[model samples]
Target chain A: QPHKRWVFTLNNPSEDERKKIRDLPISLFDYFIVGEEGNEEGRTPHLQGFANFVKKQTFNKVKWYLGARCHIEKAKGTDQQNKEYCSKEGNLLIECGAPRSQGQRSDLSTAYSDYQQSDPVGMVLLNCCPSCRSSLSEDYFLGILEECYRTIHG
Target chain B: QPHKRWVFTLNNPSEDERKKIRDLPISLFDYFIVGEEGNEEGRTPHLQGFANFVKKQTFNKVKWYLGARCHIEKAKGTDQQNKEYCSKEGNLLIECGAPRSQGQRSDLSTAYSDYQQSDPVGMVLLNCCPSCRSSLSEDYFLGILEECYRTIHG
Candidate 1:
């Protein structure tokens, strides 16, 4: 069960922010939703389900990484170069604009690279914002990595 | 209270990457928390309380603002500051650091400023690594900021 327990690390403001979260009598087990209608059931449910599942599993080692899926969507037809999700998967899925139009697509690898330079809490991913969400539905390939986690590690 | 509503703009990580949190059913209302967590409460509850209060007061003419308080604190500390968030009463008080490191005080402001320019989201005040929590004590400032928020906002 310990292995089944997942630690979900959503976006905290930063490192100091995480410590703020850790210091609370509130255990990390509490559920949190963020965004425009972040507290509404419709949106909140997305994370609530995961939290419930994590709680039900009670896997001591399971850690659910949390973060805001923030990033502009690349303009359509501009990202001619580079692979989607950075060749991590293998689809040349292009979104709007150039290779670096959207922050995630443009900076995921670089962000991770920089993050790795210093120690971090968990793996951070690139997220798509509303514009990108509307324009490029599958703009985020980081989910692929998350899926891989479930497949291989879960 | 529409009057109580405010906006905060975060820098770093570029516009593309910041869009992910835009319009998802993130909360019961349509506002986002944009600052660092001063205490263990994190952003969820605080945002919720504010949202409900705003709804009760403003009747929907106002929107909520969010950002890392540390950013504003660092900005207020120097003239190079861009954005600002005075206390609900218009005081300049804001959360300073999360896991306040006495040695890293200067570095904290520098890093936060740089993060505002380079990588907003990725710029972290405290290293988010779980291992870092053990060493966090009175040595840092998160607790202090929480107390400040309570004294002012609470």
Candidate 2:
């Protein structure tokens, strides 16, 4: 068998300023939100506002750094293919391969550190395609974070 | 604002066992993948096969190593809240934090990495989600992989 390949785009809003997003302060975990089915433009700010609310209440030090908008196309294929795509796109956490699995820990513990004191809460938000959101596993989502936290802050 | 938190679970396959993925031996660069629609049953095999393939290609020396299979519930107030629920099921990756940013660097990169390697020479047998297959930017994926390769292999 041959190695499989897929295509996706990663956007990192740099600390430097660009014309479009220059006005927004360059915070650590910038956000890029995709619109949902019937409420593309109207609902965007609501999500951001929600993110803002969460950030302010917990980690006072860190704030929503930047906001980027992107479009993720729908995927089509077998159940397995769709599931894998959803899992990777919306679920997986990539780390700096720490020894004994230290690096692949949870983004939550990693982001917030103390949870009560850290800014950005140690998490970078990601909006995924509809297909991914639709087909992804709840366990896969909840379980990983718990493990990551246990591995790090535990 | 408080930092929103979610639970995640990860299933780390044993290293020796992961080495026998047989079909798809995932590579460091091929950690995550994208799926096609309507092919849910095939999704697991794609993942398993891909993991196996990467191992074999590298002669069992290198494998992405099933990091962990994390789990989480569908977020409230989002479309996902009402989307198809996989109660007994889960997504593949071990995700952390809120799913708010759609085009954030981490989200894009994660997707981009999978998109980058969905296909390679002699390994065209494997395919990718059409959406990701069509949209991902190669130069960007290559650049990042090169960076990773330099860091890992160099």
Candidate 3:
């Protein structure tokens, strides 16, 4: 298994010190590596499977862009409700939405709204609370990932 | 421009060294980042465009998997021919093949051959010279890149 990098500072908000991304894996340099296939095709199965297992767990959930990190699920409701669901400090509450095959947005849910908006709509590190205007939602990130995949594949 | 790490050891065999992969940018930790979108949609245009421009230039060329690095071009022919094309010591001579959209096997080029083979066929660091059995050529790593991109995007 690969080593895990801490990618978030505020699920309930990192309270230890001044708020910043907090030396987490969410930094721009963070990345996920796969298919190292040292001497065989199937040798790196664990890495591939790791990605798949993580992907399956988050099918319609909030997608984090640091690529190497997976999201934690929380109660489903409005943004504030989701935040409140995290009973413990620094605990993350990930919410989700429609699957890719659905070909539909989560129907006004931040799932896709954040996908279409700029910065704050899809991210959580910048704000201690989830905002309809921040990157704290779901599909916003999934779609961006989709395009990047196609770019490399193309 | 991003700083370059030496990724190969022998275009003509590192004259002063015993020939290892060399401490280059080709390590698995290397990666190309895109769409930081820090405060605006277009803020990371250079990063996105970096991927695009580099991707375009290598439509049918040798693809290196550390993700962040791009390949160098040299004379085109067979494996040895390509290697011989590198006239100067340590000068890389990258060869290419059919486009990804061709849906073809590069008509027997190592482009796809090494792609289907295990480790050695697709990597160059181990070979020290162009060999169909190693990763010195194209498409192999491109396909790998395609899959990785999808994994992240997925």
Task: Name the candidate that leads on lDDT.
Answer: 1
Ranking of all candidate structures by their DockQ, best first: 3, 2, 1
Q: CA shift at A23, candidate 1, in angstroms? A: 48
Per-prediction DockQ, in order?
0.01, 0.02, 0.02
Candidate 2, A1-154: lDDT as tens digits: 2111111222432334122222322121112221112124443211111111112222212222323332222223333333344344242222110011112322222211232212111211111112221222122322333344444444
- Per-residue CA lDDT of model 3 for A8-86, tens digit only, reads 2222222332112222221121121211112245442111101111122233322343122333333223322223323
Off by over 4 Å in 3: A1-140, A144-154, B1-154
TM-score of 3: 0.16
Evaluated on chain B only, what are the TM-scores of all the candidate structures, in order?
0.18, 0.19, 0.18
By lDDT, the candidates rank as 1, 2, 3
Q: TM-scores for all candidates? A: 0.20, 0.16, 0.16
Model 2 quality (TM-score): 0.16
Look at candidate 2 and tell me the lDDT of residue B112.
23
In the range A93-154, model 1's lDDT, one tens digit per residue, is 11111121222233222221232212111222111211222222232332332343344333
- The true-versus-predicted C-alpha distance at residue A116 of model 1, in Å, is 24
After the best TM-score superposition of candidate 3, give how far the Cα of residue A130 lies from its true spot, in angstroms: 30
Whole-model lDDT, model 3 = 0.24
